[PDB]
Amino acid sequence: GAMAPSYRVKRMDIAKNDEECVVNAANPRGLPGDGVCKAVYKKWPESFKNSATPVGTAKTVMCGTYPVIHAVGPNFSNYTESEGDRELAAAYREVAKEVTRLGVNSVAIPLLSTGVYSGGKDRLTQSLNHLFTAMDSTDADVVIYCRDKEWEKKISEAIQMRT
């Protein structure tokens, strides 16, 4: 584990992360997809061998010795708010189990279901709070990746408020 486990946020492509493993915002079919998923496919294509997994779950595939944890958040265009909220919380709980099993000291993670699976809604607080609920009991250093400048400021504020 990290000596003083922390949360940090960076505004840049998660495919350039400086952590021991990455979480992909995957689709259930293991397809290249769009957004974070497509960047992950371009950087670690070998990790998409048998990466298909249901909504609300995470499945890790190695690219060399580097773990890619494919976490499938719900698409809020298809799910109700209640069911989607439950599956989004579940995907993050599965990421925490995988990070613990892998024994890594750090993990790069995107906010699941905030892009094309958001159903056109701002889900920063919803998704980030489910990330904290799952990851708080782990001792890995967590680095959250985002692309929007206003989202970077809001995620940073939420991290600092709890310290």
Annotated binding site for ADP-D-ribose: 13, 27, 35, 115-117
Which residues here bind Cl ion, judged by CB under 5 A? 12-13, 115, 117, 146-148, 151
Q: Which is nearer to Cl ion, 2 or 12 (CB)?
A: 12
Burial class (CB in 10 A: 0-12, 13-18, 19+), 10: middle
Minimum CB–partner distance for residue 24 and Cl ion (Å): 11
162: Cβ contacts below 8 Å, ≥ 6 apart:
132
Q: Among all residues, whose Cβ is closest to Cl ion?
A: 115
CA–CA–CA angle 154, 15, 47 (5° rounding): 125
Minimum CB–partner distance for residue 38 and Cl ion (Å): 11
Q: Which is nearer to Cl ion, 13 or 20 (CB)?
A: 13
Q: Which is nearer to Cl ion, 93 or 147 (CB)?
A: 147
Cα gap 153→71, rounded to integer Å = 25
Question: What does the block give as tokens for 103?
Answer: 């024994």
